[PDB]
Write a protein that holds these residues in place. Structure first.
Motif, PDB file in Angstrom:
ATOM      1  N   UNK A   1       0.808  -1.201   0.000  1.00 27.71           N
ATOM      2  CA  UNK A   1       0.000   0.000   0.000  1.00 27.71           C
ATOM      3  C   UNK A   1       0.843   1.253   0.000  1.00 27.71           C
TER       4      UNK A   1
ATOM      5  N   UNK B   1     -26.570   4.247   4.879  1.00 24.04           N
ATOM      6  CA  UNK B   1     -25.932   5.538   5.098  1.00 24.04           C
ATOM      7  C   UNK B   1     -25.893   6.373   3.829  1.00 24.04           C
TER       8      UNK B   1
ATOM      9  N   UNK C   1     -26.911   8.438   0.663  1.00 22.03           N
ATOM     10  CA  UNK C   1     -28.059   9.281   0.360  1.00 22.03           C
ATOM     11  C   UNK C   1     -28.432   9.041  -1.099  1.00 22.03           C
TER      12      UNK C   1
ATOM     13  N   UNK D   1     -28.234  11.907  -4.085  1.00 26.48           N
ATOM     14  CA  UNK D   1     -27.080  12.769  -4.265  1.00 26.48           C
ATOM     15  C   UNK D   1     -26.325  12.457  -5.545  1.00 26.48           C
ATOM     16  N   UNK D   2     -26.602  11.307  -6.160  1.00 27.87           N
ATOM     17  CA  UNK D   2     -26.001  10.904  -7.420  1.00 27.87           C
ATOM     18  C   UNK D   2     -27.113  10.373  -8.316  1.00 27.87           C
TER      19      UNK D   2
ATOM     20  N   UNK E   1     -16.576   6.427 -12.246  1.00 31.02           N
ATOM     21  CA  UNK E   1     -15.785   7.619 -12.591  1.00 31.02           C
ATOM     22  C   UNK E   1     -15.715   7.867 -14.084  1.00 31.02           C
TER      23      UNK E   1
ATOM     24  N   UNK F   1     -18.835   9.870 -15.438  1.00 33.98           N
ATOM     25  CA  UNK F   1     -18.889  11.321 -15.288  1.00 33.98           C
ATOM     26  C   UNK F   1     -17.984  12.039 -16.279  1.00 33.98           C
TER      27      UNK F   1
ATOM     28  N   UNK G   1      -5.534   0.948  -0.173  1.00 37.04           N
ATOM     29  CA  UNK G   1      -4.745   0.476   0.946  1.00 37.04           C
ATOM     30  C   UNK G   1      -3.822   1.543   1.504  1.00 37.04           C
ATOM     31  N   UNK G   2      -3.595   2.628   0.768  1.00 37.70           N
ATOM     32  CA  UNK G   2      -2.809   3.720   1.321  1.00 37.70           C
ATOM     33  C   UNK G   2      -3.594   4.465   2.397  1.00 37.70           C
TER      34      UNK G   2
ATOM     35  N   UNK H   1      -3.034   3.075   5.456  1.00 37.33           N
ATOM     36  CA  UNK H   1      -1.643   3.184   5.872  1.00 37.33           C
ATOM     37  C   UNK H   1      -1.469   4.315   6.875  1.00 37.33           C
TER      38      UNK H   1
ATOM     39  N   UNK I   1     -20.095  14.713   2.029  1.00 33.22           N
ATOM     40  CA  UNK I   1     -19.631  14.038   0.832  1.00 33.22           C
ATOM     41  C   UNK I   1     -18.267  13.431   1.076  1.00 33.22           C
TER      42      UNK I   1
ATOM     43  N   UNK J   1     -10.325   6.787  -6.632  1.00 32.26           N
ATOM     44  CA  UNK J   1     -10.710   6.441  -7.993  1.00 32.26           C
ATOM     45  C   UNK J   1     -11.582   7.500  -8.637  1.00 32.26           C
ATOM     46  N   UNK J   2     -12.270   8.303  -7.834  1.00 34.57           N
ATOM     47  CA  UNK J   2     -13.233   9.246  -8.353  1.00 34.57           C
ATOM     48  C   UNK J   2     -14.559   9.120  -7.638  1.00 34.57           C
ATOM     49  N   UNK J   3     -15.070   7.898  -7.520  1.00 35.02           N
ATOM     50  CA  UNK J   3     -16.440   7.700  -7.064  1.00 35.02           C
ATOM     51  C   UNK J   3     -16.694   8.440  -5.765  1.00 35.02           C
TER      52      UNK J   3
ATOM     53  N   UNK K   1     -19.861  10.271  -3.161  1.00 37.21           N
ATOM     54  CA  UNK K   1     -21.267  10.117  -2.838  1.00 37.21           C
ATOM     55  C   UNK K   1     -21.650  10.970  -1.643  1.00 37.21           C
ATOM     56  N   UNK K   2     -22.958  11.128  -1.473  1.00 33.18           N
ATOM     57  CA  UNK K   2     -23.522  11.896  -0.372  1.00 33.18           C
ATOM     58  C   UNK K   2     -24.021  10.981   0.733  1.00 33.18           C
ATOM     59  N   UNK K   3     -23.753  11.376   1.975  1.00 31.50           N
ATOM     60  CA  UNK K   3     -23.933  10.495   3.115  1.00 31.50           C
ATOM     61  C   UNK K   3     -24.770  11.133   4.209  1.00 31.50           C
ATOM     62  N   UNK K   4     -25.195  10.273   5.133  1.00 25.53           N
ATOM     63  CA  UNK K   4     -25.699  10.680   6.434  1.00 25.53           C
ATOM     64  C   UNK K   4     -24.702  10.432   7.551  1.00 25.53           C
ATOM     65  N   UNK K   5     -23.867   9.406   7.421  1.00 26.77           N
ATOM     66  CA  UNK K   5     -22.750   9.218   8.329  1.00 26.77           C
ATOM     67  C   UNK K   5     -21.750   8.291   7.662  1.00 26.77           C
TER      68      UNK K   5
ATOM     69  N   UNK L   1     -22.616   2.918  13.089  1.00 32.79           N
ATOM     70  CA  UNK L   1     -23.402   4.095  12.742  1.00 32.79           C
ATOM     71  C   UNK L   1     -24.783   3.714  12.234  1.00 32.79           C
ATOM     72  N   UNK L   2     -24.851   2.761  11.307  1.00 36.30           N
ATOM     73  CA  UNK L   2     -26.123   2.461  10.673  1.00 36.30           C
ATOM     74  C   UNK L   2     -27.171   2.012  11.679  1.00 36.30           C
TER      75      UNK L   2
ATOM     76  N   UNK M   1     -28.837   5.140  12.863  1.00 35.37           N
ATOM     77  CA  UNK M   1     -29.523   5.864  11.806  1.00 35.37           C
ATOM     78  C   UNK M   1     -30.898   5.279  11.502  1.00 35.37           C
TER      79      UNK M   1
END
Lengths: 51, 243, 241, 234, 238, 250, 233, 244, 104, 204
Positions: free
Chosen positions: C14, G55, G57, G60-61, G80, G83, H29-30, H33, H151, H156-158, H160-164, H178-179, H182
């Protein structure tokens, strides 16, 4: 596949409706069927995958 | 972009790319070239025709200029890229110097275009060899031959490409001044040399002559069959020296 | 295998191996310590003399990156002098456009961010060079930052770099320093150096020292000759005893 | 197994350049002798057929009317150097108005010798070192001088050098037959004796090129007639 | 063995091979010494010939009227770094109307040879310099490496079998500060005479001396300007 | 970097160009595509390689492109690359029109493309274009022509040729049945249905499994129409009634 | 910093294949199932939305984007890379609309988006895109459904599936698709053919549907989808 | 299939025979780290970040080790991963945020400033010339028409929007804690949220903190500025969670 | 071997192996002596033109030549004859060409 | 301006299922007439004519550089061009040369391939679109033809009345201008056919 090595290539295509009817007749004879039977109808029901 | 070094020195002291391009020549077609006193005849063996192709688009004897023609043997693709730049050069020179190109000069430029390509980044060598043929501003005949390396020598006679080691062995003994004394003897020398490395008779040898101050004529297939009849007639009148 | 030939290759572990190796080229250099007090910063380099043929006090490892910012380096020295010019060049474009001596918090983040751009591509090689920027201002106090090959900067009260990184960080942890005038620190630095140096692994050494603090009026110099001697006498005495 | 074009041998010198030296041992033989009367350059053509014109081979080329040259190795790569030499000597004549010292020309040609560079250059730079060693012989204000220039950029003045596929053999026979007090007619005859042992075919008037450069003349290549006269004596 | 094909790769041990090697290009070069006084700096170089009929390659290259250098390595690289210095000292005359002080010149060589030890597929310059200059701080010697480091020295030697010289120079480093000009060059020669085989000696056809002083713009001596320094020279007995 | 370089523009020890040679084999998998010259026009036939019940057709042809008013061509190989080469052709042929103010000659259009296909094999280190094309056309120097280019950068005129799947089997059938001269456009469509029927392993062709496009001259302008399903269905019935009457010898 | 590589990574193999595109098609077949059904007055693009907790939302996407007033996309594969193509398409559409003052026809947009994906199998130092776009649109009186592949090819369909289990879904559609459907099933029948590849319970926030009729493309509000999920509509 | 090598495919970013990018599955994996963990919880009035702060020595200053960065005045965010890459990507966020305000004149939404951090990362995926950054940004901030928001964008890019969410070493363990909090659902006041965040981090690591072992970033709707709570304010919530 | 370019050179080092005979595809007149040698044990019908079947295809190995001879002779054994006709060679030549064309 | 340097007239006119576009023919270098027949009307597909008057160079560049965009659009797309787009397409082409413009002013006459709706429009030399339903004019006699058509027009005409109007409207407006005249040609486009008549004008 170098021409002249293997000396004949035969193709065994999957049974058509007619061949499949015949193949259904070769195994049928191996168990006690019954008078009224329409294997022709059965072979047409099959899509024709293998023997 | 793509700045890589394609051609580097071997450890043995060669250049493997320019030596491999030598093999793309050997997989070519034979072409010969003899120079007379008023006439220069280069013939390419194999039209390559399959009774379906045109003979107008398989030609391997193009014409740079008016007094300068060129036959090649290698990758047909590359050859067309050289021939083009050569034709440009042949007009760029008429603009800046009034005379037409001499045959040395349009060669030194084809060679120097091939040498730069074996010492620049990104490029593989041109995989062609060439016979540049022509007449100077003095009626003199000239015959030059290049190769992928980008060297060039003059010749009196020469063959390139496939089966060229054999044809050079026939021109050592047969090129004299008992031959090529007439226009009819010089054409017959070329055909008699390709008949040693064509395995289908004379109906397979496209052959172009150039004559002093006139332009390049390609001999239609009828005239070549007439000349092939005079050859085969002459190997049955060598039966007057075996009896 | 083939995870070390490029900075552009994570390993399965990593972690980028080319940056790991760079940092190990630092560890095989002589030691440099920084120690920030409450009104200045003092620098200390353990410069080995490898022959008697090199001129004394020359080819330093103490640069001036700006008129109020020391830079003491460790590690492969060629790449060090390269950074010391990128930093001078930044701390000039900053005085040009904003019109006032560049704040060391920012000069650090900008020199780290430049080192970092060299661990991303395969076309370049990560710097083999950790180094400390000291500085004093009257609006910010002393600040001491330390950068490394990774491209990480961290505020420090003291630190060390080089082959005796471990032994020297002890000596500074066992030292009060948020209460000492500049003048008292320099004695400590000399004493710490002498302890962490091995003359059974190296021949001898020259002790390089740098103010930058209230004494000098926010400039950065090298300690004057007389105070340097006093710090060497007080350091032989703590090795006697 | 591949490396760069600019790799050092752990030994201590540049892979390519050490290689390009081997490309010389494939080339023809050249012999240059420096005298007080002038410089002579002798190089064997090495024709490969009887069908070749023993005249369209050029292995001695004029650089100016007082600086000859002889190439051995890959004669194709010399084309780029020779043309840089000329345009060098001319530019030096167009600015300072006066001939160019022989040493200066050879220096200006040697600055290209190390100039390959797979990347971080133009889309036009060389990719590989030049495959050719030169013998610039000229006459300027120091009298005659002869320089040897190999693909390492290291040029050096010689009193008499041999290069090519008989560098080893000829160089040893120059050491026995050379001395300060020569004239030009003794040298041209001395070299063609060395050049007659190390050739593979008989020495004709069509198998060498001679040139000379003398204080009271230009660069002057000997024709097929004049050669008959100095092979008669041998 | 895979960490040797670029300057760009580090080695697990924490070195770079391509930079180590380059420095073996210097130890193939021809011995050369440099020492100073407090009024003169001297470059004494042992030229070399690769044949019996051949001249010797110049080891001392004139840069400006107060800077000399002595190369040792690829000569094609030595004239690439010499043209850049000649160009740096014509940039100073032309802008500041002063001689470029040596310490700030060696810092430009340092910035320009650093670069290609960190870009892909470019190499280090395979040449080591000794830079004898004299400005407003008296005399200097500077040793440059292909690694891109450099040093202020009081008396350095590079090239082949240079170690034999370095010891001679390290036993006499005290005497150098008090020498007149001709006495200094004697030291340099006596140090350079310890780098030869035991069978041959310093002649006038393979020694090159370069002197720069307080009142003496950098000169070079060859052939028969070297004879006033070999004559008078001690005999070196075995 | 150098480790990850393919070196696609470099010779083999043997004297070949491996990438251009592989690109050939990628063309041996595309749909069959043949062309026949006549005296009274010329025609391209290609089999639809992709067919399905859901698949739709929106365009006049899925393999025939019009490059000009007077020229069309058919492609074979990597379809993606074919959307690139056919766009440069169209742009070449208008750039010709913008200077000389004529329709471009048939031969030139091809070579001008083959300078682009040939460039890619000689420098730059891109993978070559894996496409071969047939160009049917008309010009005022030679009348109708047919041409065939390769990923090498070689082209040739032909009087009747084939490219792509089972090409060598078609050409063997054309060498025998094709006459030098003496070809009307009615007769060529008989030869084209017969040759196509033999290189494809289906029991019989269908108006929905091929595409035949002709190029004729009518009234001093060029016309290039694609036969509807009815016009091709006639040809398929007249070939089965020549196989039913090709048993009258026994 | 850097220059960039210059040499293509997609290369021919001895087979005559472009191995990189073959693999990037296997990434496509890992992606979330997507179906497309041209109706006779609209196009339906439905897709299995991605999530793996409570968790996230789920508003949002969007896996169903609008490219223009009359265009839509869904995709199957790497998120990715989607987009990037949605964003080069929206610009293509705006250059086209800036020169002709006319909404870009749907045949056009797919033919250009495809030539961007073709550029990344023959450019220096890149890998092909890891997605298949399904482009609906309704111009000139008709509906259209296309599909471009990471190769660069594109095929007009009358109904298709992509992503995971796209061989089971193309069969399921082959029978259930009888032309002259109303717009409202293609929805129904679409949602069904997501279910032939989806494990769990479908909800209004778990799939995304988009239609595309003469009135213009529009994503269906969560409420709207909950009703079609009466599994009777 | 099944993990095979295409030769080069673990050294650059090109597809494997399987259909994956080994080079990006490594860059995740970083993030672990680093050795730190960060939780982020959304309320109905405020979003909270809480980060473990680990000062290894007595030498390091404690006020310049932080992981909470101010991107705008209405956008904070927490960086987990390789500290070098992190700071390199925060610098780049600030740039985009202020470039946005400069071009459109209404400061940037939290939505879009992630979408752009996401798309810069995506390029590093698609080219072979460089590796992707080995870090992971979590932005928070109050939106003018959707309440608070959280957010998270990956190497990688992906995004998303979250609640926690969490990120880092205990990224699996947290999202299981967390879940549960919630699907029950509360009022989620300001004191509710901070409570759920600290108790999640405190139980998954087992520390039971000192005010000097966490830094807490928070953004309320009443006051939309992004504060970092001092040790005085943090302790009020820790001894309130020791009572309850 | 038929891939010689993939052999560890040290294996074929001069003094380990001394002579590298190469076997190029036959000429046209040679390719006719081969097709004339396998047919010598047969009885060919009179309409068979050897020179039309040779040139008909191209780039034949003496293995492909024997493969066209063998097949056609076999077609004569499906009919119970001993005269390989000019048509037996057409069917054959067309079943070794698909053989070369298919299975590639 | 320098759009007077050559002179020229064009004129389009809507009917009720037809459209007629008329132009003078005269290529003259200042006052000196060179040739009496020099086309300022070009086919742009069927039932779509662009009329370019003004500087005779750009008349020829803009009809050549507009054919190159048009052809490369009827191939790349199978549709045939719409008359509303050929306006926007030739707007963009002029505005591409914003600074140092062309010196032509397009007039576009034509019918919608999918119905037969008539459509005309003019443009400024920099590329501004002006859709009208009466008639559009451009040239050096613009003001002559505006006045002449404003009182010689009718809201609906058949193919025989239109050709009457525009004819007797061109002849009288172009005879009152020095640098125009010497031959009028008139296309008139129905859905069925494209009739093209030349009028007998005063050769002086």
């Amino acid at each position: 596949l170098r021409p002249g090595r293997i000396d004949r290539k035969i193709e065994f295509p999957p049974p058509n409706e007619e061949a499949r009817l015949d193949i259904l007749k070769i195994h049928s004879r191996k168990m006690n069927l019954t008078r009224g039977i329409n294997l022709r109808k059965i072979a047409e029901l099959m899509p024709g995958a293998s023997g | 972009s793509y700045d890589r070094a394609i051609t580097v020195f071997s450890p043995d002291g060669h250049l493997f790319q320019v030596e491999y391009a030598q093999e793309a020549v050997k997989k070519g077609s034979t072409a010969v070239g003899v120079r007379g006193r008023d006439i220069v005849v280069l013939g390419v063996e194999k039209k390559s025709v399959a009774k379906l192709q045109d003979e107008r688009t398989v030609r391997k004897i193009c014409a740079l200029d008016d007094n300068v023609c060129m036959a090649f043997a290698g990758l047909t693709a590359d050859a067309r890229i050289v021939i083009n730049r050569a034709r440009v050069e042949c007009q760029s020179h008429r603009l800046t110097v009034e005379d037409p190109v001499t045959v040395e000069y349009i060669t030194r430029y084809i060679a120097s275009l091939k040498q730069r390509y074996t010492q620049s980044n990104g490029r593989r060598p041109f995989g062609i060899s060439a016979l540049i043929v022509g007449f100077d501003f003095d009626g003199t005949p000239r015959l030059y031959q290049t190769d992928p390396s980008g060297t060039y020598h003059a010749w009196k006679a020469n063959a390139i490409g496939r089966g060229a080691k054999s044809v050079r062995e026939f021109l050592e003994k047969n090129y004299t001044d008992e031959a090529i004394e007439t226009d009819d003897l010089t054409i017959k020398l070329v055909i008699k040399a390709l008949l040693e490395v064509v395995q289908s008779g004379g109906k397979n040898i496209e052959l172009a002559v150039m004559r002093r101050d006139q332009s390049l004529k390609i001999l239609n297939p009828e005239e070549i069959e007439k000349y092939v009849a005079e050859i085969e007639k002459e190997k049955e009148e060598n039966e007057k020296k075996k009896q | 295998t083939g995870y070390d030939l490029s900075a552009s290759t994570f390993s399965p572990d990593g972690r980028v191996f080319q940056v790991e190796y760079a940092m190990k080229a630092v560890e095989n250099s002589s030691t440099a310590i920084g120690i920030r007090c409450k009104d200045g910063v003092v620098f200390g380099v353990e410069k080995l003399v490898l022959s008697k043929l090199y001129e004394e006090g020359s080819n330093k490892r103490l640069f001036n990156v700006d008129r109020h910012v020391g830079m003491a380096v460790a590690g492969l020295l060629a790449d060090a002098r390269s950074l010391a010019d990128i930093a001078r060049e930044e701390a000039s474009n900053f005085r040009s456009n904003f019109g006032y001596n560049i704040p060391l918090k920012h000069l650090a983040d900008r020199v780290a961010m430049y080192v970092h751009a060299y661990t991303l591509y395969s076309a370049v090689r990560p710097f083999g060079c950790s180094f400390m920027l000291g500085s004093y201002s009257v609006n910010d106090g002393a600040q001491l930052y330390m950068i490394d090959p990774s491209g990480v900067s961290y505020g420090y009260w003291g630190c060390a770099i080089g082959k005796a990184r471990q032994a020297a960080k002890t000596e500074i942890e066992k030292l009060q320093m948020k209460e000492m005038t500049c003048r008292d620190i320099v004695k400590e630095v000399a004493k710490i150096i002498y302890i962490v140096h091995d003359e059974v692994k190296d021949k001898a050494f020259e002790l390089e020292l740098s103010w930058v603090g209230e004494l000098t009026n926010g400039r950065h110099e090298i300690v004057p000759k007389d105070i340097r001697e006093e710090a060497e006498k007080y350091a032989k005495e703590s090795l006697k005893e | 197994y591949d490396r760069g074009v600019n790799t050092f041998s752990p030994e201590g010198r540049l892979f390519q350049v050490e290689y390009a030296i081997e490309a010389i041992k494939l080339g023809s033989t050249a012999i240059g002798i420096q005298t007080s009367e002038g410089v002579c350059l002798a190089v064997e053509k090495r024709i490969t057929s009887p069908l070749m014109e023993p005249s369209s081979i050029e292995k001695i080329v004029e650089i100016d009317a007082h600086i000859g040259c002889a190439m051995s190795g890959l004669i194709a790569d010399a084309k780029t150097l020779i043309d840089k030499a000329r345009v060098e000597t001319q530019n030096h004549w167009f600015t300072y108005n006066e001939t160019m010292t022989v040493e200066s020309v050879t220096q200006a040609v040697s600055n290209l010798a190390l100039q390959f560079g797979e990347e971080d250059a133009d889309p036009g730079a060389m990719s590989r070192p030049f495959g050719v060693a030169l013998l610039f012989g000229g006459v300027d204000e120091k009298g005659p001088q002869l320089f040897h220039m190999d693909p390492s950029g290291t040029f050096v003045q010689c009193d008499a050098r041999a290069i090519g596929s008989a560098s080893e053999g000829a160089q040893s026979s120059l050491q026995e037959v050379y001395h300060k007090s020569m004239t030009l007619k003794e040298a041209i005859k001395s070299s063609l004796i060395i050049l007659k042992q190390v050739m593979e075919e008989k020495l004709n008037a069509t198998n060498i090129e001679l040139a000379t450069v003398q204080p009271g003349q230009n660069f002057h290549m000997f024709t097929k007639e004049e050669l008959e006269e100095v092979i008669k004596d041998i | 063995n895979q960490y040797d094909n670029d300057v760009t790769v580090w080695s697990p041990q924490g070195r770079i091979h391509q930079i180590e090697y380059a420095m073996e290009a210097v130890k193939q070069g021809s011995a050369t010494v440099g020492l100073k006084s407090k009024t003169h700096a001297v470059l004494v170089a042992l030229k070399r010939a690769q044949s019996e009929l051949a001249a010797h390659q110049k080891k001392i290259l004139h840069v400006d009227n107060h800077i000399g250098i002595s190369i040792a390595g690829l000569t094609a690289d030595a004239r690439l770094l010499c043209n850049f210095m000649r160009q740096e000292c014509l940039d100073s005359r032309f802008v500041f109307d002063r001689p470029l002080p040596v310490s700030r010149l060696v810092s430009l060589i340092g910035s320009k040879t650093q670069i290609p030890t960190q870009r892909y597929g470019r190499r280090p310059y395979g040449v080591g310099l000794l830079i004898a200059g004299y400005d407003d701080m008296g005399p200097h010697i500077f040793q440059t490496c292909p690694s891109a480091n450099y040093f202020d020295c009081r008396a350095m030697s590079i090239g082949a079998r240079s170690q034999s010289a370095r010891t001679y120079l390290e036993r006499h480093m005290s005497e150098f500060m008090e020498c007149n000009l001709n006495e200094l060059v004697k030291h340099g020669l006596r140090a350079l005479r310890e780098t030869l085989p035991a069978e041959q000696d310093l002649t006038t056809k393979n020694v090159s001396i370069g002197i720069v002083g307080k009142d003496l713009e950098f000169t070079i001596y060859d052939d028969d300007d070297v004879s006033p320094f070999l004559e008078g020279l001690e005999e070196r007995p075995q | 970097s150098r480790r990850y370089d393919s070196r696609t523009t470099i010779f083999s020890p043997e004297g070949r160009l491996y990438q251009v040679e592989y690109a050939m084999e990628a063309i041996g998998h595309a749909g069959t595509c043949l062309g026949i010259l006549a005296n009274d026009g010329v025609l391209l036939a290609a089999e639809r390689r992709n067919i399905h019940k859901l698949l739709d057709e929106v365009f006049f042809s899925e393999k025939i492109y019009k490059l000009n008013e007077d020229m069309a061509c058919s492609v074979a190989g990597i379809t993606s690359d074919a959307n690139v080469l056919t766009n440069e052709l169209r742009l070449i042929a208008q750039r010709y029109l913008l200077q000389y103010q004529e329709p471009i000659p048939c031969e030139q259009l091809v070579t001008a493309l083959c300078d682009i296909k040939q460039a890619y094999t000689q420098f730059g280190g891109k993978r070559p274009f894996g496409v071969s094309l047939l160009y049917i056309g008309w010009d005022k120097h030679y009348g109708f022509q047919l041409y065939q280019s390769d990923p090498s950068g070689n082209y040739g005129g032909w009087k009747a040729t084939c490219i792509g799947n089972n090409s060598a089997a078609a050409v063997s059938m054309l060498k025998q049945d094709y006459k030098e001269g003496e070809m009307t456009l009615k007769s060529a469509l008989a030869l084209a249905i017969k040759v196509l029927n033999k290189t494809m392993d289906v029991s019989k062709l269908s108006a929905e499994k091929v595409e035949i496009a002709t190029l004729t001259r009518e009234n001093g302008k060029t016309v290039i129409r694609v036969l509807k399903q009815k016009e091709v269905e006639q040809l398929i019935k007249k070939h089965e009634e020549e196989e039913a009457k090709a048993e009258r010898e026994k | 910093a850097e220059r960039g590589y210059s040499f293509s990574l997609t290369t021919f193999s001895p087979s005559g294949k472009l191995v990189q595109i073959e693999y990037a098609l296997a990434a496509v077949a890992g992606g979330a199932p997507s179906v497309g059904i041209k109706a006779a007055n609209g196009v339906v693009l439905a897709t299995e939305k991605k999530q793996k907790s409570i968790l996230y939302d789920e508003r949002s996407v969007h896996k169903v984007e609008p490219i223009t007033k009359h265009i839509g996309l869904v995709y199957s594969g790497m998120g990715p890379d989607y987009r990037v193509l949605v964003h080069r398409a929206r610009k293509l559409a705006q250059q086209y609309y800036l020169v002709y003052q006319e909404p870009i026809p749907t045949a056009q947009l797919v033919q250009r988006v495809a030539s961007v994906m073709q550029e990344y199998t023959q450019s220096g130092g890149v890998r092909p895109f890891g997605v298949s776009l399904l482009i609906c649109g309704w111009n000139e009186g008709r509906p259209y459904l296309f599909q471009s592949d990471p190769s660069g090819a594109y095929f007009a369909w009358k109904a298709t599936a992509m992503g995971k289990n796209y061989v089971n879904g193309k069969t399921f559609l082959e029978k259930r698709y009888n032309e002259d459907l109303e717009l409202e099933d293609a929805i129904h029948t679409a949602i069904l053919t997501l279910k032939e590849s989806f494990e769990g319970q479908m909800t209004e926030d778990n799939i995304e549907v988009g239609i595309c009729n003469e009135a213009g493309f529009r994503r269906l509000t969560p409420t709207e989808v909950k009703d079609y999920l009466a599994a009777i509509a | 299939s099944r993990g095979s090598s295409a030769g080069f495919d673990r050294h650059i970013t090109i597809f494997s025979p399987e259909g994956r990018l080994y080079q990006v599955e490594y860059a995740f994996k970083a993030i672990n780290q680093g050795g730190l963990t960060s939780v982020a919880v959304r309320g109905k009035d405020c979003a909270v970040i809480v980060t473990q702060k680990k000062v290894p020595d007595k030498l390091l200053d404690s006020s310049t080790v932080t992981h909470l960065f101010k991107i705008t005045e209405n956008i904070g965010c927490v960086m987990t991963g390789m500290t070098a890459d992190s700071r390199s990507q925060v610098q780049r966020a600030r740039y985009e945020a202020a470039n946005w305000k400069y071009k459109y004149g209404y400061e940037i939404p939290v939505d879009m400033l992630c979408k752009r951090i996401a798309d810069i990362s995506q390029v590093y995926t698609q080219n072979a010339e460089m590796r992707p950054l080995g870090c992971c940004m979590i932005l928070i901030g109050i939106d003018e028409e959707q309440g608070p928001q959280v957010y998270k964008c990956d190497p990688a890019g992906y995004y998303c929007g979250f609640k926690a969410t969490a990120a880092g070493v205990k990224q699996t363990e947290s999202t299981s804690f967390l879940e549960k909090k919630v699907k029950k659902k509360f009022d989620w006041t300001f004191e509710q949220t901070v409570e759920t965040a600290i108790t999640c981090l405190s139980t998954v690591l087992s520390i039971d903190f000192k005010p000097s072992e966490i830094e807490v970033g928070v953004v309320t709707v009443e006051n939309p500025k992004f504060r970092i709570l001092t040790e005085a304010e943090i302790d009020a919530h820790l001894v309130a969670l020791a009572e309850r | 071997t038929n891939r010689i370019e993939t052999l560890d050179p040290a294996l074929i080092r001069p003094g380990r192996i001394d002579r590298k005979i190469e076997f190029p595809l036959p000429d046209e007149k040679t390719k006719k002596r081969i097709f004339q040698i396998h047919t010598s044990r047969m009885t060919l019908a009179d309409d068979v033109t050897l020179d039309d079947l040779i040139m008909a295809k191209d780039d034949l190995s003496g293995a492909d030549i024997k493969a066209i001879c063998t097949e056609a002779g076999l077609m004569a054994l499906r009919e119970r004859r001993m005269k390989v006709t000019n048509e037996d060679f057409k069917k054959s030549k067309e079943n070794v060409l698909y053989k070369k064309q298919e299975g590639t | 301006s320098i759009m007077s340097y050559n002179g020229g007239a064009v004129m389009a006119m809507k009917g009720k299922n037809c459209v007629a576009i008329a132009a003078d023919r005269r290529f003259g270098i200042q006052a000196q007439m060179v040739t009496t027949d020099f086309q300022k009307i070009f086919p742009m597909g069927d039932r779509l004519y662009i009329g370019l008057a003004g500087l005779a160079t750009d008349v020829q560049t803009v009809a050549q550089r507009l054919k190159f965009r048009l052809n490369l659009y009827e191939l790349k797309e199978g549709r045939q061009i719409k008359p509303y787009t050929l306006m926007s397409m030739v707007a963009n082409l002029l505005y591409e040369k914003r600074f140092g413009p062309y010196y032509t002013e397009p007039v576009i006459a034509g019918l919608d391939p999918k119905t037969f709706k008539p459509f005309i429009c003019s443009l400024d030399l920099i590329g501004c679109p002006m859709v009208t339903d009466d008639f559009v004019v451009s040239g050096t006699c613009a003001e002559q033809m505006y006045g002449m058509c404003e009182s010689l027009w009718e809201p609906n005409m058949d193919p025989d009345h239109l050709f009457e109007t525009i004819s007797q409207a061109m002849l009288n407006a172009v005879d009152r201008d020095a640098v125009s005249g010497m031959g009028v040609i008139v296309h008139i486009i129905e859905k069925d056919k494209i009739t093209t008549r030349t009028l007998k004008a005063r050769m002086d």
